[PDB]
Design a protein around this ligand. Structure first.
Ligand SMILES: NC(=O)c1ccc[n+]([C@@H]2O[C@H](COP(=O)([O-])OP(=O)(O)OC[C@H]3O[C@@H](n4cnc5c(N)ncnc54)[C@H](O)[C@@H]3O)[C@@H](O)[C@H]2O)c1
Length: 222
């Protein structure tokens, strides 16, 4: 089965921890000329994104109405600009990654191979399926019907490692700037869980398919 490896249980703590440390070391080692230009504010913004920053940033990005945010809105906009700037200075990652999440059942029921999913927030992934799984275990209180999803993401563009600035974790994290587009290559719906193979695509290259907002579930105009 295409998702057998990720349906199976996890590798040992020792191995997962080692793989994450290896990925952190690789990430630091792959810092390039763009990295010399990373500012103090950029470094800090990214360092704290994984702990707390993502909660405000992603909320802002997914909000239907930010008119009410006041000073918080100016702050969130600044933070987002700062993290986006930093991300472009960090090393690219290409290969497979994973994302554990929740999705509206109403959206899941529409999805087919070839459809494109657009995430309005930043998109967090891990190179380690063990890490990704941890994020489909509980969700905040929610008024909609949500289902667990495990994404297997083929990354050929857009993903940058933040693991070289995440000293407190073993998360092997690869982050995407807002509005990342992912084309569905395979979907399996089994025993109340959903496994979705996706590939990164350039938004300007998407043609003659259906795009969906991954968070709201609403169609996104071609
Ligand atoms: N999700 C992953 O697999 C993953 C991978 C690497 C690191 N992380 C780490 O986890 C944190 C980021 O967590 P995240 O990726 O869940 O952040 P997120 O901002 O995407 O999601 C925040 C919360 O909302 C839920 N959510 C997201 N999209 C939803 C949707 N369409 N409908 C309903 N609920 C939805 C999430 O499951 C989570 O409970 C950071 O600390 C980051 O370092 C997560």
């Amino acid at each position: 089965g295409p998702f057998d490896a990720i349906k199976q249980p996890n590798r040992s703590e020792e191995e997962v921890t080692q793989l994450a440390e290896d990925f952190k070391d690789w990430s630091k080692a792959s810092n390039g000329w763009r990295y010399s230009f990373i500012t103090a504010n950029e470094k800090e913004a990214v360092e704290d994104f994984s702990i707390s920053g993502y909660q405000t940033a992603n909320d802002y990005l997914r909000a239907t109405d930010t008119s009410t945010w006041g000073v918080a809105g100016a702050d969130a906009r600044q933070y987002i600009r700062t993290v986006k700037s930093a991300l472009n200075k960090l090393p690219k990652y290409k290969g497979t990654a994973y994302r554990g999440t929740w999705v509206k059942l109403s959206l899941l029921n529409k999805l087919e191979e070839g459809d494109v999913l657009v995430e309005p927030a930043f998109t967090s992934t891990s190179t380690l399926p063990e890490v990704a799984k941890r994020f489909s275990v509980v969700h905040p209180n929610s008024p909609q019907r949500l289902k667990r999803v495990l994404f297997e993401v083929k990354i050929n563009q857009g993903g940058h490692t933040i693991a070289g600035l995440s000293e407190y974790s073993k998360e092997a994290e690869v982050l995407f700037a807002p509005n990342a587009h992912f084309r569905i290559t395979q979907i399996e719906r089994t025993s109340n869980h959903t496994y979705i193979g996706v590939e990164t695509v350039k938004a300007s290259a998407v043609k003659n398919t259906q795009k969906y907002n991954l968070y709201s579930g609403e169609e996104v105009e071609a």
